[PDB]
Design a protein around this ligand. Sequence first.
Ligand SMILES: *[C@@H]1O[C@H](CO)[C@@H](O)[C@H](O)[C@H]1NC(C)=O
Ligand SMILES: *[C@@H]1O[C@H](CO)[C@@H](O)[C@H](O)[C@H]1NC(C)=O
Ligand SMILES: *[C@@H]1O[C@H](CO)[C@@H](O)[C@H](O)[C@H]1NC(C)=O
Ligand SMILES: *[C@@H]1O[C@H](CO)[C@@H](O)[C@H](O)[C@H]1NC(C)=O
Ligand SMILES: [Zn+2]
Ligand SMILES: [Zn+2]
Ligand SMILES: [Zn+2]
Ligand SMILES: [Zn+2]
Lengths: 369, 369
Amino acid sequence: DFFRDEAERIMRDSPVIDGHNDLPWQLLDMFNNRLQDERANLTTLAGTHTNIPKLRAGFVGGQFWSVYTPCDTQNKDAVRRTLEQMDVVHRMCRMYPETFLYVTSSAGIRQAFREGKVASLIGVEGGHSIDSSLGVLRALYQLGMRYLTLTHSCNTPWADNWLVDTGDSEPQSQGLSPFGQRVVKELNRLGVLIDLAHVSVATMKATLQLSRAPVIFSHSSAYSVCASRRNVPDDVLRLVKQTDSLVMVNFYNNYISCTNKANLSQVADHLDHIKEVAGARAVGFGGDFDGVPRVPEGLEDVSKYPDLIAELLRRNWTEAEVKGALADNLLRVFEAVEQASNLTQAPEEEPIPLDQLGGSCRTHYGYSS
Amino acid sequence: DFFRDEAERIMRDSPVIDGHNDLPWQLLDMFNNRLQDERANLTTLAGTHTNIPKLRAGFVGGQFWSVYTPCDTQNKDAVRRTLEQMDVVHRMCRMYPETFLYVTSSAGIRQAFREGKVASLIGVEGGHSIDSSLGVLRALYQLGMRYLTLTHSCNTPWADNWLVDTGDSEPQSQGLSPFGQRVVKELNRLGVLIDLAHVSVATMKATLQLSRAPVIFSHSSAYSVCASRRNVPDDVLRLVKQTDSLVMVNFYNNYISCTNKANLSQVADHLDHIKEVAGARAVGFGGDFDGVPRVPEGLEDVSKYPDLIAELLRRNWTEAEVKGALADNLLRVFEAVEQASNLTQAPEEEPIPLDQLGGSCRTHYGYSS
Ligand SMILES: *[C@@H]1O[C@H](CO)[C@@H](O)[C@H](O)[C@H]1NC(C)=O
Ligand SMILES: *[C@@H]1O[C@H](CO)[C@@H](O)[C@H](O)[C@H]1NC(C)=O
Ligand SMILES: *[C@@H]1O[C@H](CO)[C@@H](O)[C@H](O)[C@H]1NC(C)=O
Ligand SMILES: *[C@@H]1O[C@H](CO)[C@@H](O)[C@H](O)[C@H]1NC(C)=O
Ligand SMILES: [Zn+2]
Ligand SMILES: [Zn+2]
Ligand SMILES: [Zn+2]
Ligand SMILES: [Zn+2]
């Protein structure tokens, strides 16, 4: 088709940078992170939405690999598992160097594009990965973390998750607690993209007001099209336009069609809506591949991106608009996050009040007066 | 004084590289790692064995800063606190760049020497810091860990501590378990110095036979002089000689004189013994300043090293011998550990058997149990 051909033509110049793929999670679940297991070979990997040949077929040039540890690891082994997940991403890049180029900056993604490699970054899904520690935060930064999803589907002691909006969770921090605000201040200082997927509206609003840099939704869709609280409402979409932020669209069926069944066209509806309310520069891709049980007809795996782009061209999106959705909006936001960082500025060191630390799996050294 | 002048002349060419200083622990216990606190100013800090002017007076040119988290943090928040202690060391070097040069190699130490800065490295004290994970181990390496003390004063699921030799602990792994052997192999491939301070004799001997590179005792003294199980016995000293390893002398009174009261002359007695049994290239310093309640008369703080060097010269240690004790032996061992590392060798990924993990602060993802 003419649109598919144009899609590929454009994608050769502007490869897609996806904001959220949970392949690392599958590697842990399926092989206990044993990359040498021949069943785990990435050139032939089956049973997942992602593998090397599929990535190449979908013209994927950049990928924020999700370093995710479940909510039940909070106040348990969340920090240990986050390190192991970041480790599996590091090893993956070193194991398939002909394919992946591990990067931690916007300039780095651009170099990957020049080299014909899949720029590979790390996105930490859930603030429970830092265990309310500014020191652990900086450590994750040093290890490659380039975005932090403030919460997953559970509250941290300083940020509220989306389930607060469905009543399944209590509004603990009413957005961001004072420590949570220092976390935003710290993420801003370091140059880490703040990610609002999985958080509550109050947390979305608090962050869009508080952050000194544009923020992202690594894998969130349009609430107007599908009223899932994992999706973004119009008033927030307006804040996204105001701050020049970015919503990277999630392909999960139940967030797209609000039911188990969904198709490629319905994803373009979310894209259209985000483009109309938040603006064309606020649109991106955050498929949630390998993180969801259901993906749309036409978007069975990571090789289907050109078909989604072809559809956007069919709906009259201009080349500039699809190039922005593909990679340029993410790059603009990433560069702004880097410009707004201040590594010379003294790091945030005021800890979270002891009465706010939860669980029965810690000790209280340092805390006294 | 002839020997004090000579000590300084020699120390200006070969400043001391101490193998273990617990200042980070003091920064946590005293200020909860708040380096901006006015009391925490390192140029004026009182109440500790270490601070900037003291380090300069003692001619200290290299230091392995201990990143230590208590034994009771094992199976609790050990990993979290380890990252926080590593973080305070990183921040310390950043806050006083005119004094500390953060380094992670032997060439880096020589660079610090050339610039007149105190080479600042990280020594992780206790295998519980990795919570039996090879991924956390690699993460710590990436964060700057250049030596791992296999155990502190408690057994890990894969190594036995020194208390086993006093009867207070059971010989769980009877040295190193199979996973513990894999840890040692990973430490060798990474280029991390294996530290035998705090381990049982069975662990020292198992590691000495297994390691493919020379090892160290970052802060342990001579068992013949003081029969403390925190000290190294002669048969292990013969293994140290055989492997061209290194024993860095601890200044703690109770490990020196085997009693609360001790003096500089007695520490020199330990150095003499190690030199006799393990050889001159197996001696160094690992004072344990800021990690102990009692230090010898004449060795009150970190500014006292020149007096100890003067005593060794007085005792007829040659210039080559003291330069070895000061810096050259550690540098030799470091270079060997670096040469034994292999970047191309596939990382160890066979996890510890699930049934060997303890505590109630973890989840069993990857295994399923
Ligand atoms: C993956 O498999 C291909 C062939 O199926 C092989 O050529 C390649 O060496 C393998 N890669 C790894 C890392 O095992
Ligand atoms: C499609 O978009 C272009 C902008 O590139 C616009 O000029 C044109 O009118 C649109 N086509 C239709 C049929 O609306
Ligand atoms: C420490 O105090 C001295 C004054 O004694 C001051 O010059 C220096 O800037 C201070 N350093 C920091 C990091 O506060
Ligand atoms: C001191 O050492 C020198 C050279 O190492 C040696 O010749 C001399 O005999 C030693 N002096 C004593 C008193 O042992
Ligand atoms: Zn998610
Ligand atoms: Zn995810
Ligand atoms: Zn110590
Ligand atoms: Zn110690």
